[PDB]
Design a protein around this ligand. Structure first.
Ligand SMILES: [Cu+2]
Ligand SMILES: [Cu+2]
Lengths: 124, 122
Protein backbone atom coordinates (compact mmCIF):
# COMPACT_ATOMS: atom_id res chain seq x y z
CA UNK A 1 0.00 0.00 0.00
CA UNK A 2 2.92 2.48 0.54
CA UNK A 3 6.42 2.66 -1.07
CA UNK A 4 9.53 4.76 -0.53
CA UNK A 5 13.04 4.91 -2.06
CA UNK A 6 16.51 6.25 -1.23
CA UNK A 7 19.36 6.64 -3.67
CA UNK A 8 22.67 6.19 -1.83
CA UNK A 9 25.70 8.31 -2.69
CA UNK A 10 28.50 9.87 -0.77
CA UNK A 11 32.08 10.95 -0.52
CA UNK A 12 33.35 7.62 -1.78
CA UNK A 13 32.86 4.70 -4.10
CA UNK A 14 29.90 3.34 -2.19
CA UNK A 15 26.55 3.61 -3.94
CA UNK A 16 23.17 1.92 -3.89
CA UNK A 17 19.41 1.83 -3.97
CA UNK A 18 17.15 1.11 -1.05
CA UNK A 19 13.39 0.50 -1.46
CA UNK A 20 11.04 0.35 1.53
CA UNK A 21 7.49 -1.01 1.44
CA UNK A 22 4.64 -1.08 4.02
CA UNK A 23 1.03 -2.30 4.15
CA UNK A 24 -0.97 -0.03 6.44
CA UNK A 25 0.69 0.36 9.82
CA UNK A 26 2.34 -3.07 9.45
CA UNK A 27 5.94 -4.22 9.08
CA UNK A 28 8.30 -2.64 6.55
CA UNK A 29 10.14 -4.53 3.83
CA UNK A 30 13.58 -3.06 3.07
CA UNK A 31 15.45 -4.01 -0.13
CA UNK A 32 19.08 -3.06 0.04
CA UNK A 33 21.47 -3.18 -2.85
CA UNK A 34 24.72 -1.36 -2.25
CA UNK A 35 27.96 -1.68 -4.30
CA UNK A 36 31.62 -0.70 -3.73
CA UNK A 37 31.79 -1.75 -0.09
CA UNK A 38 34.72 -3.18 1.83
CA UNK A 39 33.84 -6.92 2.11
CA UNK A 40 32.37 -7.63 5.57
CA UNK A 41 29.86 -6.02 7.98
CA UNK A 42 28.54 -2.54 7.60
CA UNK A 43 26.29 -0.45 9.83
CA UNK A 44 23.06 0.48 8.13
CA UNK A 45 21.13 3.24 9.91
CA UNK A 46 18.20 5.64 9.70
CA UNK A 47 19.30 9.23 10.34
CA UNK A 48 16.99 12.01 11.42
CA UNK A 49 17.43 14.46 8.48
CA UNK A 50 17.00 14.39 4.65
CA UNK A 51 19.67 17.12 4.57
CA UNK A 52 22.54 16.44 2.17
CA UNK A 53 23.97 19.94 1.94
CA UNK A 54 27.09 19.00 3.89
CA UNK A 55 27.33 15.42 2.46
CA UNK A 56 26.26 12.65 4.78
CA UNK A 57 27.07 14.80 7.82
CA UNK A 58 24.04 17.09 7.63
CA UNK A 59 21.77 14.00 8.05
CA UNK A 60 22.38 14.32 11.79
CA UNK A 61 21.94 11.49 14.34
CA UNK A 62 20.02 8.24 14.65
CA UNK A 63 16.29 8.58 14.16
CA UNK A 64 15.04 7.72 17.55
CA UNK A 65 11.39 8.62 18.32
CA UNK A 66 16.33 2.54 17.67
CA UNK A 67 17.04 3.74 14.05
CA UNK A 68 19.84 1.14 14.00
CA UNK A 69 18.75 -1.21 11.15
CA UNK A 70 21.55 -3.66 11.78
CA UNK A 71 24.61 -4.63 9.80
CA UNK A 72 24.51 -5.53 6.14
CA UNK A 73 27.02 -7.96 4.62
CA UNK A 74 29.19 -7.07 1.65
CA UNK A 75 30.51 -10.09 -0.33
CA UNK A 76 33.95 -10.50 -1.93
CA UNK A 77 32.86 -8.16 -4.80
CA UNK A 78 31.91 -5.44 -2.28
CA UNK A 79 28.18 -6.03 -2.98
CA UNK A 80 25.68 -6.05 -0.15
CA UNK A 81 22.40 -7.47 -1.39
CA UNK A 82 19.79 -8.28 1.29
CA UNK A 83 16.15 -8.04 2.27
CA UNK A 84 15.27 -6.85 5.78
CA UNK A 85 11.96 -6.76 7.60
CA UNK A 86 11.84 -4.20 10.39
CA UNK A 87 8.83 -2.98 12.43
CA UNK A 88 10.24 0.37 13.42
CA UNK A 89 10.25 1.96 9.95
CA UNK A 90 6.84 3.59 9.39
CA UNK A 91 6.14 5.26 6.01
CA UNK A 92 3.08 6.81 7.67
CA UNK A 93 2.25 8.79 10.79
CA UNK A 94 4.24 10.98 13.28
CA UNK A 95 7.15 8.69 12.97
CA UNK A 96 7.31 8.44 9.17
CA UNK A 97 10.93 8.10 7.95
CA UNK A 98 9.83 9.70 4.70
CA UNK A 99 12.07 12.74 4.37
CA UNK A 100 14.88 11.37 6.51
CA UNK A 101 18.06 9.59 5.49
CA UNK A 102 19.48 6.12 5.11
CA UNK A 103 23.23 5.91 5.93
CA UNK A 104 25.69 3.04 5.28
CA UNK A 105 28.91 3.09 7.51
CA UNK A 106 32.50 1.96 7.12
CA UNK A 107 32.35 -0.14 10.30
CA UNK A 108 29.88 -2.52 11.95
CA UNK A 109 27.96 -2.28 15.26
CA UNK A 110 29.63 3.52 14.59
CA UNK A 111 32.06 4.26 11.69
CA UNK A 112 32.38 7.02 9.05
CA UNK A 113 29.57 7.75 6.58
CA UNK A 114 30.28 6.21 3.11
CA UNK A 115 26.92 7.09 1.57
CA UNK A 116 23.37 8.25 2.27
CA UNK A 117 20.20 9.23 0.52
CA UNK A 118 16.96 11.04 1.35
CA UNK A 119 13.96 8.74 1.76
CA UNK A 120 11.56 9.87 -1.01
CA UNK A 121 8.16 8.58 -2.20
CA UNK A 122 8.11 6.24 -5.14
CA UNK A 123 4.89 5.09 -6.90
CA UNK A 124 3.15 1.94 -5.53
CA UNK B 1 7.95 25.76 13.15
CA UNK B 2 8.75 23.33 10.25
CA UNK B 3 11.71 23.22 7.82
CA UNK B 4 12.64 21.19 4.70
CA UNK B 5 15.49 21.11 2.19
CA UNK B 6 16.23 19.78 -1.31
CA UNK B 7 19.72 19.57 -2.76
CA UNK B 8 19.44 19.95 -6.54
CA UNK B 9 21.56 17.96 -8.97
CA UNK B 10 21.10 16.37 -12.33
CA UNK B 11 22.44 15.38 -15.68
CA UNK B 12 24.09 18.74 -16.23
CA UNK B 13 25.97 21.59 -14.62
CA UNK B 14 22.90 22.98 -12.89
CA UNK B 15 22.95 22.63 -9.09
CA UNK B 16 21.51 24.33 -6.07
CA UNK B 17 19.94 24.39 -2.67
CA UNK B 18 16.30 25.03 -1.85
CA UNK B 19 15.03 25.52 1.71
CA UNK B 20 11.34 25.62 2.55
CA UNK B 21 9.88 26.90 5.79
CA UNK B 22 6.35 26.87 7.24
CA UNK B 23 4.62 28.04 10.42
CA UNK B 24 1.74 25.66 11.25
CA UNK B 25 -0.63 25.24 8.28
CA UNK B 26 0.34 28.70 6.95
CA UNK B 27 2.22 29.95 3.87
CA UNK B 28 5.58 28.44 2.88
CA UNK B 29 8.76 30.44 2.42
CA UNK B 30 10.97 28.98 -0.34
CA UNK B 31 14.64 30.06 -0.68
CA UNK B 32 16.10 29.19 -4.05
CA UNK B 33 19.75 29.38 -4.91
CA UNK B 34 20.63 27.59 -8.13
CA UNK B 35 23.79 28.00 -10.21
CA UNK B 36 24.93 27.14 -13.77
CA UNK B 37 21.63 28.11 -15.41
CA UNK B 38 21.16 29.61 -18.88
CA UNK B 39 20.44 33.30 -18.17
CA UNK B 40 16.68 33.89 -18.39
CA UNK B 41 13.48 32.21 -17.18
CA UNK B 42 13.31 28.67 -15.87
CA UNK B 43 10.40 26.48 -14.83
CA UNK B 44 10.54 25.56 -11.16
CA UNK B 45 8.11 22.82 -10.14
CA UNK B 46 7.15 20.31 -7.51
CA UNK B 47 7.07 16.78 -8.78
CA UNK B 48 5.19 13.90 -7.20
CA UNK B 49 8.10 11.53 -6.35
CA UNK B 50 11.33 11.63 -4.37
CA UNK B 51 12.62 8.97 -6.79
CA UNK B 52 16.08 9.70 -8.29
CA UNK B 53 16.95 6.24 -9.53
CA UNK B 54 16.44 7.23 -13.15
CA UNK B 55 17.84 10.79 -12.66
CA UNK B 56 15.19 13.52 -12.72
CA UNK B 57 12.79 11.43 -14.82
CA UNK B 58 11.74 9.03 -12.04
CA UNK B 59 10.36 12.04 -10.09
CA UNK B 60 7.25 11.74 -12.27
CA UNK B 61 4.70 14.48 -12.95
CA UNK B 62 3.56 17.67 -11.27
CA UNK B 63 2.42 17.28 -7.71
CA UNK B 64 -1.25 18.04 -8.05
CA UNK B 65 -3.57 17.00 -5.20
CA UNK B 66 -0.87 23.23 -9.31
CA UNK B 67 2.68 22.12 -8.34
CA UNK B 68 3.88 24.76 -10.79
CA UNK B 69 5.93 27.13 -8.52
CA UNK B 70 6.51 29.63 -11.30
CA UNK B 71 9.57 30.68 -13.24
CA UNK B 72 12.84 31.61 -11.54
CA UNK B 73 15.23 34.10 -13.13
CA UNK B 74 18.88 33.34 -13.78
CA UNK B 75 21.19 36.38 -14.07
CA UNK B 76 24.05 36.93 -16.52
CA UNK B 77 26.19 34.62 -14.28
CA UNK B 78 23.58 31.87 -14.54
CA UNK B 79 22.63 32.35 -10.89
CA UNK B 80 19.03 32.28 -9.88
CA UNK B 81 18.69 33.62 -6.35
CA UNK B 82 15.14 34.34 -5.18
CA UNK B 83 12.64 34.10 -2.33
CA UNK B 84 9.14 32.85 -3.06
CA UNK B 85 6.06 32.65 -0.85
CA UNK B 86 3.59 30.00 -1.96
CA UNK B 87 0.47 28.72 -0.20
CA UNK B 88 0.24 25.36 -1.86
CA UNK B 89 3.42 23.84 -0.38
CA UNK B 90 2.50 22.16 2.92
CA UNK B 91 5.28 20.57 4.98
CA UNK B 92 2.52 18.88 7.00
CA UNK B 93 -0.62 16.83 6.34
CA UNK B 94 -1.94 14.51 3.56
CA UNK B 95 -0.46 16.95 1.04
CA UNK B 96 3.02 17.30 2.54
CA UNK B 97 5.67 17.77 -0.20
CA UNK B 98 8.16 16.12 2.22
CA UNK B 99 9.52 13.18 0.25
CA UNK B 100 8.72 14.58 -3.15
CA UNK B 101 10.99 16.38 -5.61
CA UNK B 102 11.83 19.95 -6.70
CA UNK B 103 12.72 20.17 -10.42
CA UNK B 104 14.27 23.11 -12.37
CA UNK B 105 13.68 23.12 -16.20
CA UNK B 106 15.56 24.28 -19.28
CA UNK B 107 12.59 26.34 -20.48
CA UNK B 108 10.01 28.66 -18.87
CA UNK B 109 6.17 28.38 -18.62
CA UNK B 110 13.92 19.19 -20.02
CA UNK B 111 14.95 18.47 -16.43
CA UNK B 112 18.33 20.10 -15.57
CA UNK B 113 18.28 19.18 -11.89
CA UNK B 114 16.12 17.96 -9.01
CA UNK B 115 16.36 16.88 -5.39
CA UNK B 116 14.26 15.02 -2.86
CA UNK B 117 12.52 17.24 -0.30
CA UNK B 118 14.03 16.10 3.05
CA UNK B 119 13.65 17.28 6.67
CA UNK B 120 16.22 19.74 7.98
CA UNK B 121 16.47 20.90 11.64
CA UNK B 122 14.34 23.91 12.70
CU1 LIG C 1 24.42 5.83 11.32
CU1 LIG D 1 8.45 20.23 -13.75
Amino acid sequence: TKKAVAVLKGNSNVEGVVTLSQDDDGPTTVNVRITGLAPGLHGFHLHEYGDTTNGCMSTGAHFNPAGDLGNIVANADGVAEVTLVDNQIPLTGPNSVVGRALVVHELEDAGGRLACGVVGLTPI
